[PDB]
Amino acid sequence: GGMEKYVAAMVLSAAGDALGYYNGKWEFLQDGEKIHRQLAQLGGLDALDVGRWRVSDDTVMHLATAEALVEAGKAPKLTQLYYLLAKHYQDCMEDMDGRAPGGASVHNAMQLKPGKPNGWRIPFNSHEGGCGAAMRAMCIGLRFPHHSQLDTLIQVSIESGRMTHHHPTGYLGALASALFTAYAVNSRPPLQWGKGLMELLPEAKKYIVQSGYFVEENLQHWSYFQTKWENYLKLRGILDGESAPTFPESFGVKERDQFYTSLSYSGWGGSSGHDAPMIAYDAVLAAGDSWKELAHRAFFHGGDSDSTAAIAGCWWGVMYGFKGVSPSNYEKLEYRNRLEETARALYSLGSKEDTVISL
Ligand SMILES: Nc1ncnc2c1ncn2[C@@H]1O[C@H](COP(=O)(O)OP(=O)(O)OC[C@H]2O[C@H](O)[C@H](O)[C@@H]2O)[C@@H](O)[C@H]1O
Ligand SMILES: [Cl-]
Ligand SMILES: [Cl-]
Ligand SMILES: [Cl-]
Ligand SMILES: [Mg+2]
Ligand SMILES: [Mg+2]
């Protein structure tokens, strides 16, 4: 069985979010060395008890995606799944006290018209490249992990994303988040993941054209995400997807902050759809089976650390379960029971290969 990997995916995504958020305290700080100092003072990662560390918007929206997928059930109509996603995204705004939700997410969640034909579609917008689509998409790969479902994974990740983030930098982050989760479910070596994404982007672009909404804008803005990813994979020596990655000789906390800023759009690494999954991926590649290593690279840094953490913790949980994770990092986590229940339901659906009714 692999059910514990689904449970770890949902629970450790949320634990990562909570750890990388610290009730909004890391953001006053916005400095990796200062965060790691505070971490040490609190007793290091294994000492942290998340009982009073609330999850943020990332987990609220990830749960919204997951609950919509579960409610849609077996062999769903995509019209019904998209109604349910839009409804869950709009309704989850009620749970945002203290959670610092993002601009595009909030604005567009309020505009959706779940129940109306194409009611969850919004226009293209140049400013919709934040990481809010990426942070909430991983469980699409839990639901649709089979090779036979790859077109569905593409479509659902993109459309879930562009309910709030109608810009390729935004929604291709959702594709990466979902796709790498499916890769992890299938035990695909992480060194192969980037190349897999690059090879699939033409099929994502095909879907955008065939779907037919804002084709010109979407295709004219595509190069940012694709170039960022190509360049990142070349830097790590993994564009070929058949070689282990190589890291800089000097790559401690301060160097990682400078690198994350180098990837970023507006100065804060991980705040966009391209770089949130990229930083999570960089952390996965370096960390292997070490939760602590993962945390030190993806949860504790001066950028958008709750959001890189939410993605990284999900992928890592799928691969490694709870091995080496201090129980205090999740035992009293907000929504733990709910996350577990949803994980089990996703496992029931995902582990059983099925076929959707496409649009
Ligand atoms: N075209 C673009 N290309 C790249 N980055 C962009 C673009 N447009 C905006 N950005 C970046 O998008 C950032 C603004 O993203 P926001 O719309 O506020 O949020 P969200 O809806 O995505 O929600 C996710 C976040 O909100 C919660 O705090 C979660 O924890 C996440 O951190 C800008 O600062 C830009 O760098
Ligand atoms: Cl630590
Ligand atoms: Cl709960
Ligand atoms: Cl609970
Ligand atoms: Mg957040
Ligand atoms: Mg964030």
Numbering used by the authors: -1 to 357
Excerpt from the paper describing this PDB structure:
Protein ADP-ribosylation is a highly dynamic post-translational modification. The rapid turnover is achieved, among others, by ADP-(ribosyl)hydrolases (ARHs), an ancient family of enzymes that reverses this modification. Reversal of the bulk of PAR modification is mediated by poly(ADP-ribosyl)glycohydrolase (PARG) converting the polymer chain to a mono(ADP-ribosyl) (MAR) modification (Lin et al., 1997, Slade et al., 2011).
We then solved the crystal structures of apo- and ADPr-bound LchARH3, as well as the structure of the hARH1:ADPr complex. The adenosine group lies against the protein surface and interacts directly with Ser124, Gly127, and Ser270, while the interaction with Thr167 is bridged via a water molecule (w570). The environment-facing site is shielded by π stacking with Tyr263. The pyrophosphate coordination is comparable in its arrangement with ARH3 and involves interactions with the buried residues Gly130 and His163, which are absolutely conserved in both ARH1 and ARH3, as well as a short non-conserved surface motif (Gly101/Ala102/Ser103). In the hARH1 model, the 2″OH is located between and coordinated by both Mg2+ ions, while the 3″ OH makes contact with MgII as well as Asp302. In the electron density map, we observed positive density extending from the α-face of the anomeric carbon.
